Structure 1
Amino acid sequence: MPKTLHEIPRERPATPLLDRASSPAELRRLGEADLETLADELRQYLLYTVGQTGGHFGAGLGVVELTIALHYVFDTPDDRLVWDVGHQAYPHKILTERRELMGTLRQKNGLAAFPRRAESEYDTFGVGHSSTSISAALGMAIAARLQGKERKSVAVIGDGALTAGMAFEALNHASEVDADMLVILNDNDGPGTLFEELGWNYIGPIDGHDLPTLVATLRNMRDMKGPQFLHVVTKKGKGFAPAELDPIGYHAITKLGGPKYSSVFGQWLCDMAAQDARLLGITPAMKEGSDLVAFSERYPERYFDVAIAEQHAVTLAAGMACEGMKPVVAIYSTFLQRAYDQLIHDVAVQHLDVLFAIDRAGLVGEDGPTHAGSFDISYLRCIPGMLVMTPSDEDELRKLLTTGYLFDGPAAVRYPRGSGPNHPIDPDLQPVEIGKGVVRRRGGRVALLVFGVQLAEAMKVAESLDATVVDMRFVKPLDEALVRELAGSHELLVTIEENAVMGGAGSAVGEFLASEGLEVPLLQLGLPDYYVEHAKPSEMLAECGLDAAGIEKAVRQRLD
């Protein structure tokens, strides 16, 4: 009989067998009967180390036994293993020469949040966004078949990630080319006939915590040919009672302010829905992260979780707007990249009335560059019809959400993870004038044109220089009249945005100055042209020069 734990170890547990299984080859030197003892130990170590660093929690616990069985049966790293999303791959990392590096997990210069090709030869594909594993593993198998290399290709994909359209495309295509690969459905939330129809050989469901059945099944399927589909059933949080009971809260943990911007949005969504029965709320499977929680309890008939289906979320919004409803698509900047065609082709080309509440805009911290919201100003502002907005604090977020909502056409409001300066929030629901900035400080000589939440750091810098500071509010349409005035009365314009400099809000200013032959010097601050390694957000901002110290240095260095 399995035991269940209710507490996290505060001290390094004794794992004498896990320590002999530091790599897959050493693991495969062990005996089948020891494997369940190895599992208990790895589970114990996993609880301990995540309690030490924080990180993802419940999903890894669900795949302890599956991960053991895969590295025992398959000749890794020669056999290719692709983890979908990778938040469940801490056990993987533990078994692939990183056990004693777990203490550096998610810290600057330590192990990254997900499998990462640069991090280890045992990581075949950098993941983070979901549902890429089947496609990636198909690519690997097609290439290995052509090269004659006789390696296996295995994709482990959760039942959630299977809701994405790109997973369906890969399953179809793999059948097309009769690829020799294995898809393991890690299902933890009449299964078989669908996958048989799509041309796969379906096996299961089997118990994903039964190591003897897992090993024998995988042994049998390892050398089967053609597209193989193994359906495994797991318990999220398995072995830790709190996580078993509340898998949502234990999806991640912290190691043992004002409101979050997502909470300011969530409150706005409720308040406007109480005033306006037209409002509909849409999320591609991120209710807790984007924080539609209270909204979905209060307005269940007007809340739509479309699963991991960004593309359908946006075109669905377009159809609702066609009937005069007022959809709000809640979506992180990094995940909106996957619905760009629907946004352009179905919303923008038709000028449809859809609001995009873009959370996690800018650097996102420990999750690193796979999740960075670095590009949405650049990829949205080039799209005709888009209203593009950058609130600088909690009050501005509520106001710009109202403005884009009420605007008759497509609008984007972008904001970062975390909390803000904690300024007062006007409880009313009124918009602001579209295309007009707010002068937050009258100065001289240097003008800081701020798009977004670096305003408070720019205010610190302006004090030393007696600079003008504008809270721009709008990337598109730009406050051209204000920029024109500032360009004639100042000797230097300085743009500041938590977005790539290339194609960004500062370049809209640059484009405006050029069209009118305004000759004023321009300094664009923002995110550089490389992928910023995972660290604390404050650490990442400092790296990019977007704290007061970096901005002052950049302005000072230009003027000297």
Structure 2
Amino acid sequence: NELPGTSDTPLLDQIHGPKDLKRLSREQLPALTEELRGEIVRVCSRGGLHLASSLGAVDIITALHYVLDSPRDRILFDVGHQAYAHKILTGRRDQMADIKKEGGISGFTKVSESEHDAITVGHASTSLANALGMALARDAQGKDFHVAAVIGDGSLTGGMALAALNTIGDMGRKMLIVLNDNEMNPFAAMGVRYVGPVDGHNVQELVWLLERLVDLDGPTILHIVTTKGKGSAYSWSAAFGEAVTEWAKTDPRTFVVTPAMREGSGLVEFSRVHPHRYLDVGIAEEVAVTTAAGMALQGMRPVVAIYSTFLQRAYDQVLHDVAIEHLNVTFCIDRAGIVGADGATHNGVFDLSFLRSIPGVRIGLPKDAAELRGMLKYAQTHDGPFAIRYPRGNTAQVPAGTWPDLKWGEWERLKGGDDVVILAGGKALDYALKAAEDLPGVGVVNARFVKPLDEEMLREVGGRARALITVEDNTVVGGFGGAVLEALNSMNLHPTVRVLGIPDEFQEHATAESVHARAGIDAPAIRTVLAELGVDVPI
């Protein structure tokens, strides 16, 4: 029990779980609220994080955990970036300094981290459907516990949230939805008792109101209003932002669509220079891709700027709405491969697998900003869809007016050697060049095209090499290694091949470097495979 001061927390020191929180009287909850605010700011500041959303949520989370009995009652957080107060109140206060770090805890709720985490989230708008499943399962088991979902105003505009709300209406089952609105319809929300708006920062009035709502029949939306945040490095994103901004100046058919990730995708400058050629469709990736398809049908050259992990939401839209009529949609896919800190919900290691199987979708991996420019120019000037994927990370700035002629599907040899040849693009290529550096028999090819592959160069290298190594910042299942084995098979070439990539296992929050070392795709791990294939490494 330390002295009163600027950063004492007498109440939190006694709270190890929600049961300890219930020992407080309602009148004490405003003081806890301020302790939680102080705790979040003083620990979760460095690295930015989703501090602003968690701060906005402190009072509704305190009230929910005071009124409800987690883990018997299920509190579901949409996305989960707003649940830092939830983790402090559920035995993880001492782990907040390590949030998103290897050996720490997730930046989102994760079922396997705590019995208090009802869903594993990261992708937005899943809380309502999960909530429905838990309510239906509860009713089937004759149990009586409460299901409460906390969803932001942004998340509630997602297709699967609105579709789920409609169903929650039709089903008429007991559940509470807290709409957490920090910005201040009849086809989605019929059958749903609406309550509010109400002050989202009044922890006593929220405890009062929840004790009323929690026991009512059928589904309730509680509309709360919250204040957001109450209390050398040249990125691939920037390289893209600069290339497309430059491109649009001399292509009036170019239109850039983002699903509400303008700053992430590096389109701040693009939004200000070309406001007439910029569309933020909101959070819905499915709307972004089908809208781009409508634009391409009317003679435009749309570019969808989207994270690899988020493009998963639009798989059927790419296949059905773009690929069937071979439409002019270019996909500039950021956060390609392991993103690291954000963990298994955000690691973009599936795009080379799910896009490859779609007829007519070309796939490029640029090694640098000049190749990115070459691919974007090709994509925007040739028929049908193209995907260009690049990681979170940096690359050399490139001079204005850099627009090389790149023949799509052509690989390039970057290092001499015929005994063993490493085939790799993007981040994997930099690993390959490093791994090969002192080995004269070890060739390196920039496999900068996954679809189509360079069949001629693969035939030449496949016919002479004692062994090939494939390296990809993607799952080894049906990805770049699979494409290479399928192309070798159809040529009836049978060289030794080592397929290096992410294993068929979800990768938890850590640095990309850690995931890459344990996956065995980094330069040291490639150097180990070369030795295993009988390459004489220098002493």
TM bracket (short chain): over 0.9
1:504, CA displacement in angstroms? 0.7
Per the alignment, residue 122 of structure 1 pairs with: 116
CA deviation profile, 1:471-505 (whole Å, cap 9, x unmatched)? 11111111000010111222111111101111011
| CA shift in 2, pair 1:381/1:426, >3 Å | farther
Question: Retained in 1: the 8 A contact 2:166–2:187?
Answer: no
1:179, CA displacement in angstroms? 1.3
Deviates more, 1:12-21 or 1:157-166: 12-21
Per the alignment, residue 449 of structure 1 pairs with: 423
| Partner residue of 1:330 out of 290, 301, 305 | 305
1:59, CA displacement in angstroms? 0.2
For residues 448 and 280 of structure 1, what CA distance do their matches in structure 2 show? 37
Per the alignment, residue 99 of structure 2 pairs with: 105
Matched to 2:113, the amino acid is E
Deviates more, 1:41-50 or 1:550-559: 550-559
For residues 286 and 118 of structure 1, what CA distance do their matches in structure 2 show? 29
Question: Retained in 1: the 8 A contact 2:162–2:188?
Answer: no
1:225, CA displacement in angstroms? 1.1
For residues 53 and 14 of structure 1, what CA distance do their matches in structure 2 show? 24
1:506, CA displacement in angstroms? 1.4
Per the alignment, residue 373 of structure 2 pairs with: 398
* Structure 2 portions without partners, runs of 5+: none
| CA shift in 2, pair 1:533/1:183, >3 Å | same
1:537, CA displacement in angstroms? 1.7
For residues 293 and 144 of structure 2, what CA distance do their matches in structure 1 show? 47
1:197, CA displacement in angstroms? 5.0
Question: Retained in 2: the 8 A contact 1:53–1:104?
Answer: no
CA deviation profile, 1:238-271 (whole Å, cap 9, x unmatched)? 12xxxxxxxxxxxxxxxxx451001111011100
Per the alignment, residue 65 of structure 1 pairs with: 59
Question: Retained in 1: the 8 A contact 2:169–2:189?
Answer: no
Per the alignment, residue 529 of structure 1 pairs with: 504
CA deviation profile, 1:185-223 (whole Å, cap 9, x unmatched)? 00001x9x7489522000000000011211111110010
Question: Retained in 1: the 8 A contact 2:334–2:391?
Answer: yes
Matched to 2:223, the amino acid is H
For residues 198 and 508 of structure 2, what CA distance do their matches in structure 1 show? 39
Question: Retained in 2: the 8 A contact 1:53–1:105?
Answer: no
**1:195-274 paired onto structure 2 within 5 Å:** 198-239=190-231, 257-274=232-249
| Partner residue of 2:487 out of 502, 509, 512 | 512
TM-score (norm 2): 0.96
Per the alignment, residue 243 of structure 1 pairs with: none
* Secondary structure at the counterpart of residue 264 of structure 2: helix
| Partner residue of 2:25 out of 2, 27, 31 | 31
Question: Retained in 2: the 8 A contact 1:388–1:476?
Answer: yes
| Partner residue of 1:296 out of 262, 265, 271 | 271
1:132, CA displacement in angstroms? 0.4
1:101, CA displacement in angstroms? 1.5
1:458 aligns with 2:452: no
Per the alignment, residue 244 of structure 1 pairs with: none
Query: What percent of counterpart residues are identical?
Result: 47
* Structure 1 portions without partners, runs of 5+: 1-10, 240-256
For residues 250 and 407 of structure 2, what CA distance do their matches in structure 1 show? 21
Question: Retained in 2: the 8 A contact 1:447–1:494?
Answer: yes
1:424, CA displacement in angstroms? 4.7
Matched to 2:103, the amino acid is N
For residues 425 and 165 of structure 1, what CA distance do their matches in structure 2 show? 41
| CA shift in 2, pair 1:195/1:18, >3 Å | farther
**1:545-556 paired onto structure 2 within 5 Å:** 545-556=520-531
For residues 276 and 320 of structure 1, what CA distance do their matches in structure 2 show? 15
Per the alignment, residue 306 of structure 1 pairs with: 281
Supply the RMSD in Å over aligned alpha carbons: 1.6
For residues 227 and 394 of structure 1, what CA distance do their matches in structure 2 show? 51
Per the alignment, residue 46 of structure 1 pairs with: 40
**1:70-109 paired onto structure 2 within 5 Å:** 70-109=64-103
TM-score (norm 1): 0.92
Question: Retained in 2: the 8 A contact 1:53–1:106?
Answer: no
For residues 318 and 111 of structure 1, what CA distance do their matches in structure 2 show? 40
| CA shift in 2, pair 1:348/1:52, >3 Å | closer
For residues 166 and 156 of structure 2, what CA distance do their matches in structure 1 show? 13
Question: Retained in 2: the 8 A contact 1:448–1:493?
Answer: yes
Matched to 2:347, the amino acid is A
For residues 86 and 318 of structure 1, what CA distance do their matches in structure 2 show? 32
| CA shift in 2, pair 1:132/1:395, >3 Å | same
**1:6-21 paired onto structure 2 within 5 Å:** 13-21=7-15
Question: Retained in 1: the 8 A contact 2:166–2:189?
Answer: no
* Secondary structure at the counterpart of residue 438 of structure 2: helix
1:437 aligns with 2:427: no
For residues 479 and 182 of structure 1, what CA distance do their matches in structure 2 show? 55
Question: Retained in 2: the 8 A contact 1:52–1:103?
Answer: no
Matched to 1:442, the amino acid is G
Deviates more, 1:228-237 or 1:532-541: 532-541
